[PDB]
């Protein structure tokens, strides 16, 4: 129509259509989920496969962003990698200037700021990936989720990608504050597997990560035995 060809146009409805078009790119990717548990944060993504070959353990979507915090991207993983790179760089810069761990809140606001900032330039494609940020610091667990638009909010549970609706409905049933790590693992795996549309995709791979007192308040993949137990429980529940 002419009002949907650049990011700095501004439609007669009041809307910026290019950011909605990036959101539509995020909505049609693999599901991502983050849960703020009683004593820590657990992240879990639905890394769907397309070929029998992709060596299990390939294009990771849950990236560390600093020793105390991690991040999970949905949508164009190519753009998620740059959001993650910028988050890394900003946490490092905060350390170097002020000399203490960048608080998760500030880091989330800065990543959201950058994602939005790339929405202002006429010569930049907007980011096509929204990310869940699950840091952990002296304020405890803090789960943030950043939309392509730039809007970031602190959550108790987040879910983006295809699984938005189903994931949010399943999380609402959950007693987030009472449940602890090693319990978030089962809940995340179960809901991911439930969300997965075998009629739409095939042979997905499940990732997870978590920051809590067990991990001495650092981000690191789940001990694989816990993942195997949780996947078994999820399969049993799905039966």
């Amino acid at each position: 129509t002419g009002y949907d060809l650049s990011v700095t146009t501004f439609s007669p409805d009041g809307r910026v259509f290019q950011i909605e078009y990036a959101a539509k790119a995020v909505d049609n990717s693999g599901t991502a989920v983050g849960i703020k548990c009683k004593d820590g944060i657990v992240l879990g993504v639905e890394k769907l496969i397309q070929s029998k070959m992709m060596l299990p353990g390939s294009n990771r979507r849950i990236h560390s962003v600093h020793r105390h915090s991690g991040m999970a991207v949905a949508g164009l993983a190519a753009d998620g990698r740059q959001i993650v790179a910028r988050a890394k760089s900003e946490a490092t810069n905060y350390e170097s200037v002020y000399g203490e761990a960048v608080p998760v809140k500030e880091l989330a606001d800065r990543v959201a700021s950058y994602v939005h900032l790339c929405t202002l330039y006429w010569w930049l494609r907007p980011f096509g990936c929204g990310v869940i940020l699950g840091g952990y610091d002296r304020d405890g667990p803090q789960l943030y989720m950043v939309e392509p638009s730039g809007i970031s909010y602190r959550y108790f549970g987040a879910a983006i990608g295809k699984g938005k609706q189903a994931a949010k409905t399943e999380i609402e049933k959950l007693k987030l504050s009472e449940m602890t790590c090693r319990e978030g693992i089962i809940e995340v795996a179960k809901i991911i597997y439930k969300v997965h549309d075998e009629a739409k995709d095939k042979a997905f791979e499940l990732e997870m990560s978590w920051i809590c007192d067990e991990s001495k308040r650092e981000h690191q993949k789940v001990p694989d035995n816990l993942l195997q137990e949780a996947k078994a429980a999820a399969t049993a529940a799905l039966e």
Partner: protein, 221 residues
């Protein structure tokens, strides 16, 4: 100019690991402004380094190495920098900053053990570097490498290593005038990781008859 500067940092590759010792003093010209400046740090999983020379510059090198090691760790692809790569990065940075006539004024002793291959090396304030079984910086390069060369052994025990390293460090304490009696020994080993000794001071001996009475007489001395 160097303002707050430290002193010798000796180094001794011992069986099953590596040991490094360095006093806790930071001097300001002739004064000892500071006596509790931990001058040994652990870098990454496989490394450990001490520094001599300007203490501001050393604190900056720690920021460089911390960013390096954190960026290395966040990959989680299953490979990391051993002592060799870290020491090579240190040599490159020190030489590069010499090329700018804006040197880091430090002398670095970096060592560690990875995959069962134990490395120990040094870097100068102008990029001069070498890897050896036992290294030292400053006066530890005059008054300690003689005794280290004399007594180092291929399979030195941990206790023999500590006792040699204290022999060296005490010999310095006798005759450096820049050294404080406080000091630390740092142990790095495979599968144990870096372990830094709590600060302590070494007993010293002065009661020789020649010292008590220079010359000899009932009145004079």
């Amino acid at each position: 100019y160097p303002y707050v500067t430290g002193t010798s940092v000796i180094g001794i590759k011992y069986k099953d690991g590596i040991l490094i010792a360095a006093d806790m003093g930071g001097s300001y010209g002739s004064t000892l402004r500071y006596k509790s400046v931990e001058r040994l740090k652990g870098i990454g999983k496989h490394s450990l380094l001490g520094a001599s020379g300007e203490i501001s510059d050393f604190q900056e090198l720690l920021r460089y190495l911390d960013d390096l090691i954190l960026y290395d760790n966040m990959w989680d692809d299953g490979n990391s920098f051993g002592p060799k790569e870290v020491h090579n990065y240190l040599t490159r940075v020190m030489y590069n900053r010499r090329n700018k006539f804006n040197p880091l004024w430090n002398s670095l002793v970096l060592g560690g053990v990875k995959n069962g291959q134990k490395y120990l090396g040094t870097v100068n304030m102008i990029g001069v570097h070498y890897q050896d079984n036992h290294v030292a910086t400053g006066f530890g390069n005059h008054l300690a490498v003689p005794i280290l060369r004399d007594e180092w052994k291929e399979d030195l025990s941990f206790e023999d290593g500590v006792r040699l390293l204290e022999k060296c460090m005490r010999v310095l304490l006798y005759r450096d005038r820049s050294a404080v009696n406080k000091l630390q020994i740092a142990k790095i080993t495979e599968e144990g990781g870096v372990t830094i000794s709590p600060p302590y001071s070494l007993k010293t001996y002065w009661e020789f008859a020649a010292f008590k009475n220079p010359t000899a007489g009932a009145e004079g001395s």
